[PDB]
Design a protein around this nucleic acid. Structure first.
Ligand SMILES: Nc1ccn([C@H]2C[C@H](O)[C@@H](COP(=O)(O)OP(=O)(O)OP(=O)(O)O)O2)c(=O)n1
Ligand SMILES: [Ca+2]
Ligand SMILES: [Ca+2]
Ligand SMILES: [Ca+2]
Lengths: 218, 419, 1005
DNA sequence: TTTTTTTGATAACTTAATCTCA
DNA sequence: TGAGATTAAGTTAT
């Protein structure tokens, strides 16, 4: 639960014990990039970089992976904002509401459901322009996702071409699920009934089912 | 992403739940599904299994041979028929408990095991026992519905129902040998019995209790008894005059009873059962020497080499006596069922089945022989590898090869007319 | 318009997608042509009429027949014919992706569909008319009917081309440059414009030099520029800042080049220069569509390939550039790695293997030696290539052991005259090569100066020109043109697909020509089947002439002869016992007579059954035989082209091309037996293998025990067809044109899957060669039949058959004499393997030569030879263990990295993985690396090698072992000792010697 | 502000780890 | 604690 020392602007790393085999390398992948990354303003808060690395990891069973945060506004954790006017989170919410048969909801904060922790591949973005920081986060994201998937039964990802080289980014085999957001598909994500797929995959691995009803605010 | 993969994974999990009671087809389907899953999703928690070990004792407790007090509840006491148990999951023929290899069954009981089996999903498998060409059921594992419901369904389908009781009073009853004998007398059940089991609400695992005595007395000799069409069984006879039950030729081979000696046979209130625990390869040779040269053991029973002709073919085809080929083929063409059965079956297979030859032994004998065939008919033959002629059964079978080839020629030249 | 020759084809990946063609005119004008992009579907007339939304476009394909290519097991002779349905088919084009359920021919590409449907070759020249062309932009035209526009074809003509061979050199500190801390130091360009003017220029960053250094450089004749505007490509040395250098690189890359060529530049050079450009100033390299509508930024993207065995893992990674202007960006590293098989794929190794010559000593000196090369010393063309590379070379390797700097160079009209700074050497002829140098880059970077900067600029321009030298030596342009012509693919991806994809173009052409569609319904099941036959060697030492006879394209010719195709398979008749086997054999002997049908007896696919006969129809030619025939015709044409080449480069290029076509034919056959392929046929692969086995058995039986006397040659057996009776003479006595005074006997000793070795009791090379030619002529004229042809490869001397697939010998080719120099060849021995050793190879070569000499002079009367061999082996081993003078390079082993492992925690992995986690350099999923066995120096001789394969460590370029580490000589000695003892005859002496220092029992073959 | 296309076979040898009976 | 059989991985010939 302590922190580490970096000679850069943030200087705020929530380092949990379970994440011990990360920092001793992560700074080596971040010291040479932070100086060039901080010279340009970024959509997420610069003081908010490592916030999901303090929670315990040996609890979760499935992790949802996002390629990058939203181009405008960001609370750090994927799919969490008090705006409720987007393209990805709204359709996911509609699909999960159709699955669980719940109509009244205000706020999801998927980070709070037990057994699931959301993940962003790239930990920063730019105001308005997206996928403009792949070079700044390539190796860092690779190492972080390898460590995440080392102790997770099934990994959930969004995107087909976006998540296409994931089978080679991480070496240890793991059950990986890739999604398909509509974009030009005309609301094709409604056909992507993958929540039942990951639930039955957890069933096949004699694992406790994940219920999509803990993370709600009324 | 789609629904086809979801359904495939769901069915893979469903067949993974039921793995103890399964056959080769289920195993290969499971392996294919496992390979597809581990290829598509790059990782699967389960692996491929090839042992195919059948174990049903996990669903039962330990055998009870001492007096005990029963627990409060509702009791449905039923007995168990002595013999080899043939479990059966679904969709195939019955397999053997502890061997894995399935057994060919008559179509009537095949229709029964297709229809009444697992009314919707309640019964995991029906435990069938075969004794003296008698296929009868016993206690089965039930999870959703009650075994009494399955018994009622089988009774309304005409199946042979074992005598079942209904006990509700508890009064801290002590189950003793006197109560067991009284219950067995009440059930009548002239068929031999080895143990009983009761059905209790709530509990899933069944309890099996048996009461008997050792009574190590003697054994005198053996003899042969007929059951049906060329079906013979060995029965051990003692000095008193009664016979001790023999489940199969395998039991006699294991007990290796040769002369009037002292062997362990357990005695019950009605019958006696040989010991189930124990030269070696020569026991069958000694048995065939003592019982007669014109005999051979096949499958679970014995058989005798006789004269094979039109009578055997008519008996196997369920038709009356036949004299000439013209009326024979006319009768064959008259009934659609017989002609479709003979069309769906090969000449060699039905010709072998008419004589009741063993499956593997006859194939080995043929593979160790040479034949000369003209006009699709065999007329001369010989044996090349004589080293395989050590089993007396194969020699007895070869003794009737002339009748076998005559039957083969008749079948070929009548199917030529039947096209 | 008018005469235009195509250069490249490329698609647009925007909202409204278009297909573009880049072409050049006779004068040299670049013309871009645009076509609409469609999705192509094939449907039946009923389905076409049942499509409620009317399709945008449709064409009448005509009447086509669909055939089910499923295979079923038949226990009787009642075989039902395949389902063939003749209908009328429609080829529909849809601007969007439609989901027709009953669509056929789904395995082909839209680009291929466009090519064959419009009758347009990917490469060629056409006389375009202007009525179908609309001038959209200045130089960009639109064509809505490409079918009519390309109706006229003209003979090919030569056009100018633009080349940009680039090479950068970065300044690293520890072992590898980083885009965030390490700046570029040099950037060398070889630029060729449309006028044929070649310009070489290197740019040196002035930020790494001080004011005095800049003044010295500008006094020496270096032009220092302050902005991109004043830069001119006429000074070979230009000084500038990093930002100006990056802007010049951007404006050179953004140009409409034809080829931008680099060695490992997609992964390193282009990525580095881009990341620097967007880091220092934040501007992108913009590529624009020919119509000026879609603008993209440069971004290298990765393509991963998967194996077809086991867990299928990951086994290949490549990097590509995205651009929408027609320029082809080429990386020679991937091309060389995929095309050639070598121990290492570093640039120095490739140059050393490619550029070599034989130099004759002309003068001597105290520290300098003068060499000379021309057609009189080495083969024709080698000297010219060495002189061409010498224009920019700096170091030369002599005897593959001495690295010497070039003092003076003179390029003659026929060769070169190079002076080298090497110590005095004996003899008069040596071997010169362009390989490794003796300079450490990190140290010279640490002390950057004027002379160091100029030397590194010279090295960088040498690398940039070496890219061009390898481009010309490998014939990349000719191979690209031929691949585009044959595979029916755009020139940008000719070398981007494997066999399963490159044959789809010709497959579609053949299917449309024959009007056939192939469909399958039942699930395919994979079963094992037997392969080729290998004969066990009869001896180990020969000391006699051995002739080799080899079939010509055995398996494709078997497929052509038997017409083995999935849609021409009548059925498989199988038996479980002998009554049914006899009956069905008797029925099959008459039901399917073999002037038209063929029946192949294969091993049963199930343990239950004892027989299996596959029936094929040879009345209508199948798809696979026609594809193989086309590939064989192409191979024969390119072999004929090879036979008319004088220079070394032309011969090498043509040999590589014909080898590639042979591999393509073999891979097509293998795909016939590949389950995941759309042409899978278990029966066809089984039949091909069985036919080949019977053919080689027949050849061996006929040749073995055959002797010639007087004018007649006697074959062992009758010349009878091994499959069915033929109207041919079967007498084994054949007229021989050789003189009456020849008497020799032949004994077959060895064979491999199509090759037969015949031992002749003769030692005259000329007599053996002429007798072998006579034998091959006779066995092609009479022994063989139909399309089966044989050849005589060479004659072997001092043959040593170590095992069933390993042998060392001296080869005399067909066109050779006794005075000709034999070629020492090895097959499977520990000389060609890449993971044995370098010291082991030398030791085994010396000992094998000594044993061969002892056997030739007459020895083996007792164990004296064994005693001498053991004494020499012990002496050498003890001396080399005590001296420890051999370098680490003699004890290095090579292995390939991949992830196709059945067990996740494989010992092979966690070695490359741990290397990648502790080093900045990365070993990719197809990279070949180095490893060696090491141990602490304070470890004595160990006679019980336990807990091994964990001491091996990856050795990179920058690796020097310390005084506390040493080479584990025991592993190398144990493998070397076990090999020599197997070559001897004594057993107790070898076992006792082996047991002494090696606590294990020797294994004897 | 995010999307279609992949993938030849078997045979024979050497070296090393790991499990079972003696 | 040795011999001996088995399995996986790597390389080459064909
Ligand atoms: N990589 C390979 C090499 C060979 N073969 C098979 C098919 C060939 O027909 C046979 C003989 O191999 P060769 O190397 O002799 O090849 P070919 O006989 O086809 O060619 P050549 O014209 O050089 O004799 O082995 C194969 O399947 N795959
Ligand atoms: Ca360089
Ligand atoms: Ca370089
Ligand atoms: Ca050949």
């Amino acid at each position: 639960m302590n922190s580490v020392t970096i000679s850069h602007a943030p200087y705020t790393i929530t380092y949990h014990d379970d994440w011990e085999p990360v920092m001793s390398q992560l700074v080596e992948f971040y010291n040479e990039v932070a100086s060039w990354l901080l010279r340009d303003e970024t959509s997420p808060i610069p003081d908010k970089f490592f916030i999901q690395l303090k929670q315990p990891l040996r609890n979760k069973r499935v992790c949802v992976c996002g390629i990058d945060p939203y181009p405008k506004d960001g609370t750090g954790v994927p799919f969490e904002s008090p705006n409720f006017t987007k393209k990805s989170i709204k359709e996911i919410a509609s699909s999960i509401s159709r699955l669980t048969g719940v109509i009244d909801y205000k706020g999801y904060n998927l980070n709070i459901i037990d057994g699931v922790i959301p993940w962003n591949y790239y930990l920063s973005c730019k105001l308005g322009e997206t996928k403009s920081h792949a070079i700044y986060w390539d190796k860092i994201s690779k190492l972080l996702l390898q460590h995440i998937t080392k102790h997770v039964s099934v990994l959930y990802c969004l995107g087909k071409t976006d998540f296409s080289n994931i089978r080679a980014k991480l070496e240890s085999p793991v059950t990986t699920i890739v999604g398909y957001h509509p974009a030009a598909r005309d609301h094709q994500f409604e056909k992507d009934r993958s929540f039942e797929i990951i639930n039955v995959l957890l069933e096949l691995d004699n694992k406790t089912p994940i219920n999509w009803a803990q993370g709600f605010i009324y | 992403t789609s629904s086809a993969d979801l359904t495939n994974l769901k069915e893979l999990l469903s067949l993974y739940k039921s793995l103890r009671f399964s056959d080769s087809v289920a195993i290969e389907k499971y392996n294919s599904l496992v390979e597809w899953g581990t290829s598509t999703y790059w990782k699967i928690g389960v692996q491929k299994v090839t042992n195919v070990e059948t174990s049903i004792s996990d669903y039962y407790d330990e055998v009870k041979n001492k007096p005990f007090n029963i627990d409060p509840g509702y009791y449905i006491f039923l007995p168990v028929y002595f013999g080899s148990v043939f479990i059966y999951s679904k969709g195939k023929n019955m397999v053997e408990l502890g061997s894995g290899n399935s057994f060919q069954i008559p179509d009537e009981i095949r229709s029964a095991c297709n229809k009444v089996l697992d009314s919707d999903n309640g019964i995991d498998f029906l435990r069938f026992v075969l004794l003296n060409n008698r296929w009868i059921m016993e206690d089965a594992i039930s999870k959703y519905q009650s075994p009494v419901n399955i018994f009622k369904l089988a009774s309304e389908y005409g199946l042979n129902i074992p005598n079942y009781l209904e006990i509700e009073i508890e009064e801290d009853t002590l189950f003793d040998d006197e109560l067991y004998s009284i219950m067995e007398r009440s059930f009548d059940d002239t068929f031999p019995k080895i143990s009983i089991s009761y059905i209790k609400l709530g509990e899933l695992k069944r309890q099996v209790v048996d009461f008997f005595k050792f009574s190590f007395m003697y054994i005198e000799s053996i003899k042969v008894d007929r059951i049906g069409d060329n079906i013979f069984i060995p029965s051990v006879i003692t000095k008193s005059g009664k016979k001790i039950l023999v489940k199969d030729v395998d039991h006699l081979i294991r007990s290796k009873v040769r002369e009037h000696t002292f062997v362990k046979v357990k005695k019950k209130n009605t019958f006696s059962i040989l010991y189930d625990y124990d030269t070696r390869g020569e026991v069958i040779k000694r048995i065939i020497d003592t019982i007669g040269r014109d005999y051979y053991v096949n499958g679970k029973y014995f058989s005798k080499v006789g004269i094979a002709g039109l009578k055997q073919l008519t008996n196997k085809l369920d038709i009356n006596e036949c004299a000439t080929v013209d009326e024979l083929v006319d009768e064959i063409n008259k009934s659609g069922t017989v002609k479709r059965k003979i069309k769906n079956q090969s000449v060699f297979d039905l010709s072998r089945e008419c004589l009741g030859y063993p499956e593997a032994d006859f194939i080995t004998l043929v593979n160790n022989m040479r034949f000369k065939i003209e006009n699709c008919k065999v007329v001369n033959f010989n044996i090349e590898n004589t080293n395989c002629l050590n089993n007396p059964s194969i020699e007895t079978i070869y003794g009737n090869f002339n009748q076998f080839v005559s039957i083969f020629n008749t079948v070929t030249d009548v199917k030529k007319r039947l096209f | 318009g008018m005469d235009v020759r195509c250069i490249n084809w490329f698609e647009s990946h925007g909202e409204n997608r278009f297909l573009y063609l880049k072409s050049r005119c006779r004068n040299g004008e670049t013309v871009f042509i645009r076509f609409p992009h469609y999705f192509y579907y094939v449907v039946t007339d009923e389905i076409y009429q049942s499509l409620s939304p009317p399709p945008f476009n449709a064409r009448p394909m005509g009447k086509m027949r669909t055939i089910d290519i499923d295979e079923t097991i038949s226990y009787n002779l009642d075989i039902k014919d395949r389902k063939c349905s003749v209908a009328d088919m429609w080829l529909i084009e849809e601007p969007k992706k439609r989901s027709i359920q009953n669509a056929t021919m789904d395995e082909f590409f839209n680009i291929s569909w466009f090519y064959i449907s419009n009758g347009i070759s990917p490469d060629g020249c056409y006389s375009l008319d202007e009525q179908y062309l609309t001038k959209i932009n200045n130089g960009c035209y639109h064509c809505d009917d490409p079918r009519n526009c390309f109706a006229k074809e003209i003979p090919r003509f030569d056009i100018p081309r633009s080349y940009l061979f680039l090479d950068i050199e970065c300044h690293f500190d520890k072992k590898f440059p980083s885009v965030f801390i390490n700046p570029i130091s040099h950037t060398s360009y070889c630029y060729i414009d449309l006028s044929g003017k070649r310009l070489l220029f290197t740019l040196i960053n002035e930020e790494m030099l001080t004011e005095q250094e800049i003044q010295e450089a500008v006094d020496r004749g270096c032009l220092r520029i302050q902005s991109l505007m004043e830069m001119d490509y006429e000074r070979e040395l230009v000084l500038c800042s990093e930002i100006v250098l990056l802007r010049i690189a951007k404006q050179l890359l953004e140009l409409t080049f034809d080829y931008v060529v680099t060695f490992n530049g997609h992964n390193f050079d282009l990525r580095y220069i881009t990341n620097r450009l967007e880091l220092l100033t934040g501007e992108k390299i913009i590529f624009r569509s020919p119509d000026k509508k879609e603008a993209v930024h440069l971004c290298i993207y990765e393509r991963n390939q998967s194996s077809h065995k086991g867990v299928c893992g990951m086994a290949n990674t490549t990097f590509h550039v995205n651009n929408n202007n027609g320029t082809i960006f080429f990386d020679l590293y991937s091309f060389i790695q995929k095309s050639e098989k070598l121990d290492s794929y570093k640039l120095d190794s490739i140059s050393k293997n490619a550029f070599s010559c034989m130099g004759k000593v002309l003068n001597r000196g105290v520290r300098e030696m003068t060499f000379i090369g021309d057609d009189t010393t080495d083969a024709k063309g080698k000297a010219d290539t060495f002189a061409k590379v010498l224009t920019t070379g700096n170091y030369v390797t002599v005897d593959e052991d001495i690295i010497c700097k070039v003092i003076r160079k003179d390029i003659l009209e026929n060769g070169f005259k190079v002076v080298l700074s090497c110590p005095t050497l004996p003899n008069d002829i040596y071997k010169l090569s362009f390989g490794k140098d003796d300079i450490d880059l990190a140290q010279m970077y640490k002390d950057y100066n004027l002379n160091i900067a100029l030397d590194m600029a010279r090295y960088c321009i040498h690398d940039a020109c070496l890219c061009q030298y390898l481009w010309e030596y490998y014939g990349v342009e000719t191979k690209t043109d031929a691949g585009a012509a044959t595979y029916v693919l755009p020139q940008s991806m000719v070398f981007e697909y494997r066999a399963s994809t490159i044959i789809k173009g010709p497959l579609l052409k053949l299917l449309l020509e024959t009007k056939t569609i192939l469909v399958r319904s039942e699930t395919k099941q994979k079963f094992p089947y037997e392969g080729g036959k290998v004969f066990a060697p009869k001896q180990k030492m020969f000391s006699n002439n051995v002739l080799i006879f080899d079939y010509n394209s055995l398996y494709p010719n078997v497929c052509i002869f038997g017409n083995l195709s999935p849609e021409t398979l009548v059925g498989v008749v199988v038996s479980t016992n002998r009554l049914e086997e006899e009956i069905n054999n008797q029925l099959l002997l008459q039901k399917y007579p073999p002037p038209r049908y063929i029946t192949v007896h294969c091993e049963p696919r199930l343990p239950n059954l004892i027989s299996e006969i596959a029936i094929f129809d040879r009345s209508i030619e199948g798809t696979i035989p026609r594809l193989l025939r086309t590939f064989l015709a192409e191979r024969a044409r390119y072999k004929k082209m090879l036979k008319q080449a004088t220079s070394s480069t032309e011969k090498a290029i043509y040999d590589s091309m014909q080898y590639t076509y042979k591999i393509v034919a073999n891979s097509v056959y293998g795909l016939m037996g590949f389950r995941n392929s759309a042409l899978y046929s278990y029966a066809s692969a089984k039949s091909c293998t069985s036919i080949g086995r019977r053919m080689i058995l027949y050849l061996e039986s006929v040749l073995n025990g055959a002797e010639l006397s007087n004018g007649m040659l006697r074959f062992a057996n009758t010349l009878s067809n091994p499959f069915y009776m033929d109207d041919r003479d079967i007498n084994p006595i054949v007229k021989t044109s050789l003189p009456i005074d020849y008497r020799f006997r032949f004994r077959s000793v060895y064979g491999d899957t199509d090759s037969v070795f015949t031992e002749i009791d003769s030692q005259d090379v000329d007599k053996s060669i002429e007798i072998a030619k006579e034998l091959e002529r006779l066995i092609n004229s009479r022994v063989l039949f139909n399309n089966f042809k044989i050849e005589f490869e060479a004659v072997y001397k001092n043959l040593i058959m170590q095992s069933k697939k390993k042998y060392t010998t001296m080869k005399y080719s067909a066109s050779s004499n006794s005075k000709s120099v034999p070629e020492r060849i090895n097959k499977g021995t520990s000389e060609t393997r890449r993971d044995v050793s370098k010291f082991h190879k030398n030791m085994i070569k010396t000992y094998k030569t000594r044993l061969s000499e002892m056997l030739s002079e007459g020895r083996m009367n007792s164990n004296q030879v064994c005693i001498d061999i053991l004494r020499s082996l012990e002496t050498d081993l003890r001396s080399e263990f005590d001296s420890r003078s051999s370098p680490l390079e003699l004890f290095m082993l090579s292995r390939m990295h991949h992830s196709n492992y059945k067990s996740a925690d494989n010992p092979n992995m966690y070695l490359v993985t741990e290397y990648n986690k502790n080093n900045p350099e990365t070993i990719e999923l197809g990279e070949r690396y180095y490893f060696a066995y090491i141990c602490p120096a304070n470890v004595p001789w160990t006679k019980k090698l336990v807990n091994i394969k964990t001491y091996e460590t990856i050795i990179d370029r920058s690796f020097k072992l310390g005084s506390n580490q040493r080479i584990f000589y025991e592993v190398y000695f144990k493998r070397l000792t076990s090999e020599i003892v197997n070559l001897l005859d004594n057993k107790v002496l070898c076992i006792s010697f082996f047991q002494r220092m090696f606590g294990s029992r020797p294994t004897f073959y």
